[PDB]
Amino acid sequence: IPPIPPVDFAKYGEIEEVPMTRLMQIGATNLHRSWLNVPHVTQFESADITELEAFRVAQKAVAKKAGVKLTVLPLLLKACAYLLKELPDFNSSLAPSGQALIRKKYVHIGFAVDTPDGLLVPVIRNVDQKSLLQLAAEAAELAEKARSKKLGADAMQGACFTISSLGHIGGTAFTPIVNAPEVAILGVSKASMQPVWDGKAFQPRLMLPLSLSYDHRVINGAAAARFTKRLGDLLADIRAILL
């Protein structure tokens, strides 16, 4: 792969060399290994979370009595675990012989935490088996452990899918990079009030933007549009997870 010509950057003005933490360099290498290895496609969709938000906000009492803050993330984690069980090609990996996929029978999901030294993706194990407030607490713990360099590498391992949420900073949608050997990563952005046709007039609904990137070798376009559609359906009525 042809390298970039070196440029003498100080010919154009003052420069200064800051160095990279080992975590950024590790990060850097893994992403470039994902990028050259995975033919990426991104599927955009946005979900109606007007009702999910109201749920979230009404349960602020309960959540505080349990010491967890309830955010959208445990609600995202729960719906994607249901779905990763319904559509198992998403919960799997290409075997190194290129000719089989390892379907994992377990659901562990990581999520991106951006710390000072770099990106960490702590994994929550068997997300399918935990409740909203369990997930809430654990997510929170692992994030502080991650910020405070106290996350032992055991916890960065063997995830089946990654969620990257930037809803807290902003943006309309992005195209995340798959953490190979996983096969898909959900990027989530800022929710906004949007007019939505109700058959007669435009209603304001709160809409969460979602960006699913996938490994096109394993997941085709119709499988991915069916996954973000189902996910949009589950987030608009989380009670469907009950049945």
Added chain:
Amino acid sequence: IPPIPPVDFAKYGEIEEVPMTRLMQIGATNLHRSWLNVPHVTQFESADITELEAFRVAQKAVAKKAGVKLTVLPLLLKACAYLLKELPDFNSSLAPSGQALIRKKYVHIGFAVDTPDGLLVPVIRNVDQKSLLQLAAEAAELAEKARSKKLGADAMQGACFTISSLGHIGGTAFTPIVNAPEVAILGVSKASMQPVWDGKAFQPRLMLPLSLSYDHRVINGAAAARFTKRLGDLLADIRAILL
């Protein structure tokens, strides 16, 4: 216990003797044994199921694709299993030494089916672990088995709590009898549109009437009002079961 004086009933008109099935006589004896043994109290409450009904009705597609009809019963079964876990004195029994309660760590719930030969109460085991459509199917199976005399006695055993639903025939509330050695039975009646104060005006909400009878020896009045209140809360937003 003093017996009833025999009356010669044919002195007043024509009589006719029809006999009792063994099932009615069994039924009869068990209820009288419950009645003389359990000091009963009934707690009335009614729950707002306007949203639960809409859920139920929107998922008619899914339910039919799975072959189960979704009724209010699997939704009742699920909420009472959550609750029987939260308030364990309800899921327990008085030890025969009268001085201890056996807390059961399992949740199996029966429900009354009134057949031609008598009342049968098939039990669904580990209701806490089944989903709405699993529960839907099983309930349905056991009921037909019950009508068709094909329910083997194994299935009438070791329930922790009974639901008796008469919502399908009518009535405003009733006072069911506890199936000793269980300690509580939920009776459910016909839902009706009722005006409910919203702080400013009366809104029509669909209200399900509930009648919890309990064994006052084991459950006190405040524990039972807290159980139907929590149950009313869970049926008004079944998503609380998720957290």
